[PDB]
């Protein structure tokens, strides 16, 4: 055994003589190939996303790219990785969350939506007509029993909850620098963490952004309606990191 | 590969997956169509090629009707871009009965790449060798082009290629702007770039297929009429020489 | 690598029916003669012991009551094939209220004879291609008439034809032998000297099986003193 | 898109295994440790719940889920498919209760949730489960705890672990196990037999406790486990 | 059957009679109409006895599980959206007639639910046969956000008025009071009338009915 | 309706340590009598009878198809049957027919196998649980049983006072009824002993 | 696809089913399991695979499982598709009841679940049931029979017989002690257990290594009772006696 093929355990979704999973290992490294990363991270009273864009040409619009979707009025989230799998899977994600209030009467926990929508890519792993679908979802949103929520799905189906994350290539730079500032405990102000994740992107990159490389994603207790920052009020925060 | 490009259902220990790319080679392998969105329509220019005087000029079209209001330029094996053009009119004439308008180009967009992904994830079937642009112009929308390719993924564009000379031509489009030009004069420079990307040295012939769809129709879809084509090949003869 | 039952060889033919072809050439021989006067149909009942009952292992069978057909190869798959033709030939008698032409049953056979699926397909439908071929030779209003079907489904008619094992020496033999004015009793005659060339056991009236069509009668297949009539003249 | 295989991906080998079974076999014991004891007056369920930062959260997820009012679950191997196998369970308990107006017994549980794990041995294109449950419950007046395999098999026991160094944990407890302990003093040991597999300092984070008297199935809150650890009450 | 429900300012009172008529017959002197979906959420029942059990029934095993998942208490919201779509679906032969009425994190509701799938939110509800009878009780002597004792005598008052004016009630009067800290569910809680005593003794012992035959069968 | 087309009568009536369960016999189409020998109670384990009057027809299905349900339940689980389950069990049997119903009303007469609490319980014909603690009546003299009972009841009786009270009221009772009579017999259940007696009647 | 099939439905050249014959080996190396006829009644006796001192034993035997009001069986195989079979025992059996009004045949109980295994040899592409059982019954046709059943789909009727590790050794050993058409369940038992101390690797035994249920006709109705773990261990202790005397033969 230990790391030994045995059949067709390499290209189908059965187990190996060791234990694990290889085309589930394999598609985890499908959410590197974009070359996106992402970071969502945790307030006292918001949620955070920002993203990288990237638009290899001028002929490429710049603003039907994104990584941002809608996918209710409260519940945002950031698509990373293989992008035909992301748009299929945000068309699936939609499609519950607009499901579930039709058979309860009242929006969907972030938590749940996570729920089922790691428990449909489940069944691929589980499955052998189908590869796994190659991308990683993270939705934000505020619950009103509990506050800001975060949540991150994998390729595999294990949705675990956060204060801070991130996703893609440069995903362990990025937890790195997060979890000393989180041992710290600041105020955790509205500012104080758009704050953390430009800069948290910053310099596992090393860029220092203008406003049309990042678009920020984000959700306040004062307005639960999941905003897309404008590039002005992103080169507003963009500023303040030069101040400080 | 061995057992990594057999199935549409298989990683690779890379994390890609050689069915789809291996459709991408399809539209390698034929010949250009551009798209331009000027500020006021759409214009598309496919380098069909004549390959006999057998066949009738003016056949074996690349520019399809999706809807009234929809252009669709394919390049790629033309048997699956014939099956992709009734899977959209399909789609577009189902979004009219339900919702009782015209389908906005943003969403059959998004329906059509839908489609197209469900045939990267199964045995069962094989991706799509075909890439292709969407084109549409509304009084409320205002112009629009988005292309679609056998990965599934869309994008809007201002200007786009597809096909073996994506490369050439998408660099003449950079040159040129578009962001104030009409329809009428954007045809004559659609028209210019064909003839320089084009080798007539790999190609015996080849028909010069223009579409608008834009203010001077009535947001409608429409070949370009043969005075307008005549005089657009012709503008585009004497630019070749200087 | 394994291929399914449909896969085009590079060559331009599908691998199943390139076999089924091969798969007559095991087995018995048939041979047809159209004249002007009816279709008579000679084939050799192979037997293996003196122990089998030579009489009901018949291999010529009434389609209708005018329309014979004799085939060799693996006949296990034809009592598929036949049933449906009599289905045929009486559903058609049903609903138009005449006899169906020889040429017309023998299309309807054909469009069956070709159509296997791994998968997407019924789970009724044959996994492989039929290894057979049959001789219809029926009397309609064309006059007499033969066709010979081949397990790729295509149908060609005839005017004299033999299948099975011994199809080349056979039907070299054919070609010097058949002209258009022979008569139903040349053609019988002419029938079993070629067979007793081809046969490696021996012409016996227990060993064939001869039976005609006639544009006056019906199919009458021949009993064994109508054998032994006819073993004396060759 | 795909009808689905039929074919079976499980199958025998010339020796008479069911190789897959063998392997799936192999994901549950590199697990998370876990370990069972039946106190002839409730069930403790432990488990090892142990992060890679401080950045996850610890009140999102559980590995001590309830099935009804006196059944709870925990588990060893892949967390995807224990998230099915508690939702199927729960269904079955449902239309159980529903048919029957009593609340779905405990040995009943064990071999309704088992078949479901052993049909996916012998379907089409699936691999097994790569879990094994522990399903602990308080019926009739007793206790129960049982414990399923990826095979779809199921044994009764009164004291075991399971996951990584269920070797080690499986001694410790033929040895540490005293029948007739007491529900409080089997919390103890159940901790306590946790702590040799376990690697790191305990905190009240790091174990999910669940306990299971006639009083029905629960989860011990953060506070009464750094109580337990302590050892102060 | 009699069925009501009021809504004070920490709760719901839901209240109905006993009595469960089969024909012109008294068929159970005494059978509970309040049935417990959660632990915050009871609902009512009138109509055909057999349709409103095993449809409050399955609803319960919807909502015990729904809760399980997302983890929390279920909202009243969910059960009025999930009775309400499964009767539509039999277009009215399913007789339930529900008077649904918990206590969430978003305060007291209380709906009734018609056969038909029809929703009517309100403060104060009657469903049943002296329904009626109940109601005019509520148009004088109800006024909003009232304390948690004038309610219990209110319900109480509107099913007895029930009881009286009709003949498919009488009997006990059950009462539940929902509140967001405790559930009061008491099964008698008035006895309007009683059976009256037997003036004489009428019973006879043994040695009086014939038998033809008998037999023992013992056990263990 | 559909259900006085063969008669039937059933009673079922809780003493203090004991529950006993009278039926008639007879076995008729309409007005014409076949036979005086139709049982209408069966066991269902022991110390737990099930009683099912009305249509001839739905009266054997549901014995067979109940025998079929339980004989399947007492397997799988060794657990003997609890007399408050297998009610909901025939709750559930009935309502699974819900439209296009059976015409039958089930009597369920047991004691627990665990304890020995007397227990009894009708059944619509679509399906209701009424568990009372006096006494139980389906049939077609419904009417008739109920006076009967209200007046010969009593909180507690010892098993041979009870037998001589069941059968009092079931004797007066389907005399006053003509598709029903032709002898009765009557299971009484103790704890230790399962008595059935059968009571000299009207051959009317 | 059919590059990842294994096809299990398929023809050896040799003219055998691959997959049949291992089904064998699991049942090889599995749990002993031997019955022995009788006249007074029928007995199966297994040994008892897991035995530990965690388990909890709350059961009413790890191997018979009780099929009707008349017949057992005991398993030996994979124990994951026993619960399986003798689950699709008991609805075969209680269908026969609803439709005939009286208890199954033991005969015919058993080829309707062998109808079963037979399915899935011959078409499916699934892999087959790689158990083997016995069957205690009795009948109004016969009286009292054993039955035996591969996972093959095939059964065959027996008056003693054995599945499950060192089966050869035991039918040797059954073949000599067995006496045909005289057998009391008395001596069937005593048999029973020096078959078992000659496959067994403790050649004492213990009462927790068996499980022994008989079947009996008392008073109309058939009785399966499991003996309890005193009345087996005098089985056992009554043996140790057989085999003092035996050593004396000076």
Not at chain 1, 70 to 97: H, L, P, W
Not at chain 4, 30 to 49: C, D, F, M, Q, W
Not at chain 6, 173 to 196: C, L, P, Q, W, Y
């Amino acid at each position: 055994s230990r790391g030994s093929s045995a059949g067709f355990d390499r290209h189908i979704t059965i187990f190996s003589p060791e234990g694990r999973l290889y085309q589930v290992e394999y598609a985890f490294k499908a959410i590197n190939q974009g070359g996106l990363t992402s970071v969502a991270v945790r307030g006292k009273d918001c949620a955070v996303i920002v993203t990288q864009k990237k638009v290899p040409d001028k002929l490429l619009d710049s603003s039907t790219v994104t990584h941002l979707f809608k996918i209710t009025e409260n519940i945002g989230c950031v698509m990373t990785g293989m992008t035909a799998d992301s748009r299929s899977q945000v068309q699936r994600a939609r499609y519950e969350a607009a499901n579930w209030k039709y058979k309860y009467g009242y929006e969907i926990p972030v938590d749940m939506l996570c729920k089922r929508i790691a428990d449909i890519s489940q069944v691929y792993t589980q499955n052998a007509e189908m590869r796994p679908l190659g991308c990683c979802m993270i939705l934000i949103g505020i619950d009103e029993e509990q506050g800001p929520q975060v949540y991150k799905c994998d390729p595999a189906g294990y949705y675990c909850g956060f204060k801070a994350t991130a996703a893609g290539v440069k995903q362990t730079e990025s937890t790195s620098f997060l979890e000393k500032k989180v041992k710290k405990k600041f105020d955790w102000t509205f500012e104080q963490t758009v704050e953390t994740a430009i800069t948290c992107l910053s310099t596992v990159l090393s860029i220092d952004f203008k406003p049309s490389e990042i678009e920020v994603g984000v959700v306040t207790v004062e307005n639960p309606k999941f905003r897309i920052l404008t590039e002005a009020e992103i080169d507003a925060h963009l500023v303040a990191l030069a101040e400080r | 590969g061995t057992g990594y490009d057999l199935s549409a259902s298989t990683f690779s220990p890379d994390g890609r997956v050689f069915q789809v790319e291996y459709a991408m080679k399809a539209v390698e392998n034929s010949s250009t169509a551009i798209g331009i969105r000027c500020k006021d329509g759409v214009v598309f220019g496919v380098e069909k090629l004549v390959l006999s005087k057998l066949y009738e000029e003016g056949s074996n079209k690349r520019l399809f009707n999706v809807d009234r209001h929809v252009g669709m330029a394919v390049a790629g094996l033309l048997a699956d871009a014939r099956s992709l053009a009734d899977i959209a009119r399909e789609e577009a004439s189902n979004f009219r009965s339900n919702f009782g308008y015209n389908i906005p180009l943003k969403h059959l967009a998004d329906r059509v790449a839908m489609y197209v992904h469900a045939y990267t994830l199964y045995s069962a079937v094989r991706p799509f060798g075909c890439s292709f642009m969407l084109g549409s112009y509304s009084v409320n929308d205002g112009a629009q082009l988005y292309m679609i390719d056998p990965s599934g993924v869309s994008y809007g564009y201002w200007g786009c290629a597809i096909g073996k000379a994506r490369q050439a031509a998408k660099t003449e489009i950079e040159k040129l702007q578009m962001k104030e030009m009409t329809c009428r004069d954007i045809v004559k420079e659609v028209a210019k770039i064909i003839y320089i990307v084009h080798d007539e040295v790999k190609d015996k012939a080849f028909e010069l297929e223009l579409s608008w769809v834009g203010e001077l129709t009535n947001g409608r879809h429409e070949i370009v009429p043969k005075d307008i084509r005549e005089e657009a090949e012709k503008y585009a003869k004497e630019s070749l020489k200087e | 690598y394994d291929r399914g039952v449909n896969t085009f060889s590079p060559e331009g033919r599908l691998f199943q029916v390139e076999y089924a072809i091969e798969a007559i050439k095991l087995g018995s021989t048939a041979i047809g003669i159209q004249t002007s006067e009816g279709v008579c149909l000679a084939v050799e009942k192979r037997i293996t012991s003196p122990l089998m009952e030579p009489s009901s292992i018949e291999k010529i069978v009434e389609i209708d009551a005018h329309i014979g057909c004799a085939m060799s190869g693996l006949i296990a798959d034809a009592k598929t094939l036949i049933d449906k033709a009599r289905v045929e030939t009486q559903n058609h008698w049903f609903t138009y209220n005449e006899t169906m032409t020889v040429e017309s049953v023998t299309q309807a056979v054909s469009n069956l004879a070709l159509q296997f699926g791994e998968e997407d397909a019924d789970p009724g439908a044959m996994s492989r291609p039929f290894g057979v071929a049959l001789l219809f030779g029926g009397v309609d209003e064309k006059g007499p008439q033969l066709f010979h079907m081949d397990p790729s489904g295509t149908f060609v008619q005839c005017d004299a034809r033999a299948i099975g094992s011994a199809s080349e020496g056979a039907q070299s033999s054919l070609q010097e032998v058949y002209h258009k004015s022979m008569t139903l009793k040349e053609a019988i005659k002419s029938s079993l000297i070629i067979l007793k060339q081809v046969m490696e056991e021996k012409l016996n009236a227990t060993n064939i099986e001869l039976a005609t069509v006639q544009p006056g009668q019906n199919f009458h297949m021949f009993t064994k003193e109508e054998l032994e009539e006819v073993i004396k003249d060759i | 898109a795909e009808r689905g295989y039929s074919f079976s991906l499980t199958t025998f080998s010339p020796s008479g295994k069911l190789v897959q079974i063998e392997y799936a076999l192999a994901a549950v014991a590199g697990g998370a440790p876990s370990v069972g004891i039946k106190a002839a007056n409730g069930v403790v369920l432990a488990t090892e719940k142990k992060q890679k930062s401080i950045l996850y959260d610890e009140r999102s997820v559980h590995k001590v889920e309830p099935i009804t009012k006196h059944i709870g679950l925990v588990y060893s191997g892949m967390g995807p498919d224990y998230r099915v196998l508690v939702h199927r369970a729960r269904k079955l308990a449902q239309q159980y209760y529903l048919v029957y107006q009593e609340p779905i017994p405990t040995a009943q549980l064990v071999q309704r949730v088992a078949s479901v794990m052993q049909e996916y041995t012998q379907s089409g294109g699936v691999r097994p489960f790569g879990v094994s449950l522990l399903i602990c419950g308080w019926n009739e007046g007793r206790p129960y705890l049982f414990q399923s395999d990826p095979s779809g098999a199921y044994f009764a026991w009164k004291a075991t672990a399971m996951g990584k160094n269920y070797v080690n944990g499986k001694t410790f407890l033929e040895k540490r196990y005293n029948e007739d302990l007491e529900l409080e003093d089997a919390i103890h040991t159940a901790i306590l037999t946790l702590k040799e597999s376990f690697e790191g300092q305990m905190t009240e984070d790091n174990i999910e406790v669940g306990i299971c008297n006639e009083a029905g199935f629960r989860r011990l809150t953060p506070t009464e486990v750094k109580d337990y650890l302590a050892a102060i009450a | 059957t009699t069925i009501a429900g009021v809504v004070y300012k920490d709760g719901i009172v839901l209240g109905a009679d006993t009595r469960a008529t089969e024909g012109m017959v008294v068929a159970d002197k005494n059978c509970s109409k309040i049935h417990f979906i959660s632990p915050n959420i009871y609902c009512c029942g009138a109509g055909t006895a057999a349709d409103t059990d095993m449809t409050t029934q399955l609803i319960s095993s919807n909502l015990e599980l729904h809760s399980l998942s997302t983890g929390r208490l279920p909202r009243v919201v969910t059960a009025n959206r999930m009775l309400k779509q499964m009767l539509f679906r039999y277009q009215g032969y399913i007789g339930a007639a529900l008077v649904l009425g918990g206590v969430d994190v978003t305060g007291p509701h209380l709906y009734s639910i018609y056969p038909h799938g029809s929703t009517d939110k309100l403060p104060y509800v009657t469903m049943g046969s002296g329904s009626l009878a109940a109601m005019a009780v509520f148009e004088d002597k109800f006024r909003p956000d009232m304390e948690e004792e004038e309610a219990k005598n209110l319900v109480s008052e509107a099913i007895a008025a029930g009881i009286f004016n009709d003949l498919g009630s009488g009997s006990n009067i059950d009462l539940c009071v929902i509140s967001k800290n405790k559930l009061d569910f008491l099964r008698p809680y008035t006895v309007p009338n009683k059976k009256g005593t037997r003036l004489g003794r009428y019973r006879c012992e043994k040695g009086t009915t014939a038998v033809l035959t008998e037999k023992i069968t013992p056990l263990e | 309706s559909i259900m006085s087309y063969n008669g039937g009568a059933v009673m079922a009536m809780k003493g203090k340590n004991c529950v006993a369960i009278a039926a008639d016999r007879r076995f008729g189409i309409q007005a014409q009598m076949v036979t005086t020998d139709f049982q209408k109670i069966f066991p269902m384990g022991d110390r737990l009878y099930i009683g099912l009057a009305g249509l001839a027809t739905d009266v054997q299905t549901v014995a067979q198809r109940l025998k079929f349900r339980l004989n399947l339940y007492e397997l799988k689980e060794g657990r003997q049957i609890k007399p408050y389950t297998l009610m909901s069990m025939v709750a559930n049997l009935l309502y699974e027919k819900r439209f296009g119903p059976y015409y039958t009303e089930p009597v369920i007469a047991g004691l627990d196998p665990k304890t020995f609490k007397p227990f009894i319980c009708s059944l619509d014909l679509i399906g209701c649980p009424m568990v009372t603690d006096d006494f139980v009546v389906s049939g077609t003299c419904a009417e008739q049983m109920y006076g009967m009972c209200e007046s010969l009841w009593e909180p507690n009786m010892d098993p041979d006072h009870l037998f001589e009270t069941i059968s009092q009221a079931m004797l007066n009772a389907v005399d006053r009824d003509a598709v029903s009579g032709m002898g009765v017999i009557v299971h009484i259940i103790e704890k230790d002993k399962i008595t059935t007696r059968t009571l000299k009647a009207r051959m009317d | 696809s059919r590059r990842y099939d294994s096809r299990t439905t398929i023809f050896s050249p040799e003219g055998r089913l691959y997959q049949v014959e291992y089904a064998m080996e699991a049942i090889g190396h599995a749990g002993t399991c031997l019955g022995i006829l009788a006249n007074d009644g029928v007995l199966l006796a297994a040994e008892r695979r897991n035995i530990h001192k965690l388990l909890d034993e709350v059961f009413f035997s790890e191997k018979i499982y009780k099929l009707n009001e008349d017949m057992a069986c005991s398993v030996a195989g994979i124990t994951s598709d026993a619960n399986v079979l003798t689950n699709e025992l008991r609805l075969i059996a209680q269908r026969y009841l609803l439709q005939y009004q009286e208890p199954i045949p033991c005969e015919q109980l058993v080829t309707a679940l062998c109808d079963i295994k037979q399915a899935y040899t011959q078409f499916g592409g699934k892999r087959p049931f790689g158990v083997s059982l016995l069957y205690i019954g009795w009948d109004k046709h016969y009286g009292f029979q054993l039955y035996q059943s591969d996972p093959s789909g095939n059964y065959g009727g027996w008056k003693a017989t054995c599945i499950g590790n060192n089966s050869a050794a035991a039918v040797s050993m059954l073949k000599q002690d067995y006496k045909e058409g005289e057998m009391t369940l008395k001596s069937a038992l005593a048999l029973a257990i020096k078959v078992l101390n000659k496959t067994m690797d403790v050649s004492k035994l213990s009462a927790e290594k068996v499980e022994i249920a008989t079947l009996t006709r008392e008073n109309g109705k058939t009785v399966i009772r499991v003996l309890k773990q005193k009345e087996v261990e005098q089985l056992i202790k009554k043996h140790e006696e057989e085999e003092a005397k035996a050593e004396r033969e000076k």
